[PDB]
Amino acid sequence: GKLPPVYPVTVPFLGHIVQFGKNPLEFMQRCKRDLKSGVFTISIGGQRVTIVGDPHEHSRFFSPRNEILSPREVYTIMTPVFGEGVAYAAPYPRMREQLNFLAEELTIAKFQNFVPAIQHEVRKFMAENWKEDEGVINLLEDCGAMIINTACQCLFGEDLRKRLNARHFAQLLSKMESSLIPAAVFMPWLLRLPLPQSARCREARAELQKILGEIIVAREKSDLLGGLLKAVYRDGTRMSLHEVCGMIVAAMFAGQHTSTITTSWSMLHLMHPKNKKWLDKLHKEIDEFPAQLNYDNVMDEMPFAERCVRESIRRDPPLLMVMRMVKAEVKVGSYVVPKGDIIACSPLLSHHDEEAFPNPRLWDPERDEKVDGAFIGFGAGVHKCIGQKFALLQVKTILATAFREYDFQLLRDEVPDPDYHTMVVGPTLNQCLVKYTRK
Template sequence: PTLPPLVFHYIPWFGSAATYGMDPYKFLFDCREQYGDLFTFILLGRRMTVALGPKGNNLILGGKLSQVSAEDAYTHLTTPVFGKGVVYDCPNEMLMQQKRMVKFGLSTENFKSYVPLIKKEATDFMNNELKPVAGEWKQAHALHSMAELTILTASATLQGKEVRGKLDKTFARRYEALDGGFTPINFMFPNLPLPSYKKRDKAQREMSEFYQEIIRGRREGGADHDHDMIAALMSSAYRDGTPLSDSDIAHMMIALLMAGQHTSSATSSWTLLHLADRPDVYEELYQEQKEKFGNPDGTFRDLTYEDLKDLPLLDSCIRETLRIHAPIHSIMRKVMSDIPVPTSVAAPAIPEKNASYVIPEGHFVLASPGVAQMDPKVWQDASIWNPHRWVDEKGVASKALAEYDGGDKIDYGYGSVSKGTESPYQPFGAGRHRCIGESFAYLQLQTILATFIRNMEMKLEEPFPKTNYQTMVVLPLPAKISYRLRK
């Protein structure tokens, strides 16, 4: 079999770790320029084969279970943080069932109850932390503020009353310790004799016990917590009738906490930064709020879950932010059996024989939807944040984008254009491991942003921040946003 082209590197085992780690998108775009959509690079001894573009995304994200495994690529990073028995520490068939149980907790009925709760948290945060004043610009650190508000809103809703009630210093310390074990370093080196690894393990045990105590408390107290994820998981079971154990539930709650926290706070920070940078769009968003919810006396009526489906511009701002700041830049799988590469992904290796490339067992594969999302061949002014590209003058999603998705109509609002595995827009991934948190993330982001838009003006008084790739998700480097109360 013919192997994909190997990216040139100087140091054998180390390979391209430095260039990939410093700026993965630059590295991937540069390699694509030189080698095409299919190539292999060395990452600390691992052979990573990259397949780019919608066809490449499809090859990896739509890969057969017999060919690609997520658990073999991720478990060494995730299991010490989440805990045993769930997600990537069990067979894929069980993860699929766990995802179905989580989806049961992400119901429309629950979502309806979340909108006022998120609005309350966002309003309290504004009044108690940001304290905007009319006629006077104040500044806040975008990412710090949004990280705090994300955990407040996620715990007030999904995580449940007890977690929200116990967001104290102890919880913050445990969270920080767990998070400190969820970094690219931990991915590269699963076990080092470093204090951060010990802290991670201790925090995992404590966090697991914290959730299990809540679960026991609920069993004994028979309290009614119908609308949160712990309640949903406590009432669900595997197909054969086996319920989740207390430790399974605890570990899934930790997994959901970690899955949602950085992705959502990165997205809200980037969105706010772009809005502060574009007062014209911010003003348009204010008009959208006034048109849809404005009362004659200048106040706004409360948002409801149904209303969120009818905010095309706000939706487009989030969607556009996820296009150029997809929080997850690399999606990985371990190759379990040889994968023949279709000639639609890469031209035949030996054209005379029409022989295609093969990605051999033992390699890892890497999909980077962000590359297709920023491809100038697909998107006009690909690197420019332009929310209007998602709506036409009638306020509906643009036709050009519908065509990217194989001509299917875009399911506007809570759907997305990325349902298929072959698409140039997949910030939530695709296929069997696709995100199930998308609609919750949108609900949370829209409600927070709508609350800010209604009450504050914003501007950016410093250069637009560059990107930090040293973290698990793509974050903005420290930057401050200026804000003041609307008159």
């Protein structure tokens, strides 16, 4: 029945956000140490944020359903991006069905042809941008382009890509991102006020929706769009085109940076001299494969590539925190978290806990969690990442294709520092220069 200890209220407005941008790990470790507790509370903009910082308590955070811990209220910022009535802006039961419908479309049973479609786009991109025997590139910009290109080949039909290509898509998604006020998570009063950038992203989304309508009419005269319009709710009705447009935008938005960042970190580690052992170990795994790879190879026959990916996400999780609004009080350890808190779990913090991942700064693909449930890079339980399998697939295929055909050398002594200022954390951009060399 104890309230968690409270790191007492600071004066600068949203001042803890500045600390989360500079040294989030060290900050949350200091709170843990100095309050002598794995569960503690900070105040951000008058909003109590209770951080669950002990991996043994993960199940208490990820288990409860929306009737008790709800993410809807924390992601009010995305409502102009995905649309009213879509995903988290929808009532709990319609929301639940919508997410499941998108998940049905990203199950491993749907990746027939994805590996080739991906390998083809990767090969295309390397042909168009990495022409020389040798050259310098920014790995992070380049993986980004590969991720959106590959996503579009796998997911969109030939007629859709003709009308709206991957470069126009990345732009829309990048423009929408830039309209967000990530700190408004702690300023719900602000989101009740008219914002002009909200209307602009609504107008942009309307134009995309008009394009998807024109295509459906044309088709009516199997890809992601076509799959979602086949969906039937339990009440026997279909998703509206509005709702479908919305879920497509959520799909793409989610993956743009996280998968980019994950591909990039994984490559940055593999190419580093200090990790020649793992690179040789990856080559022993993938040199076995035919040129034109297949679903079976990447999915079923790449366990060690998967580890390299996992540990990159372990060491440098792209989403630093996972958050809910407590709609009814919840037990955590010896504490009770009261109604109205934001309750948060931190993959960064739990991935750097010395008990769960001894020597946490060391990238080591052959480690395993010493605390069961501690790895939460793709979340857990009810709200577990539904794109995990696609993202792994994309990223593994890109790793194999790229490393089979080129070597890479980082143009700096140590692996990039993560840059924590951004919504999705990745390696610092101007530290990602890389020399490539065709084999």
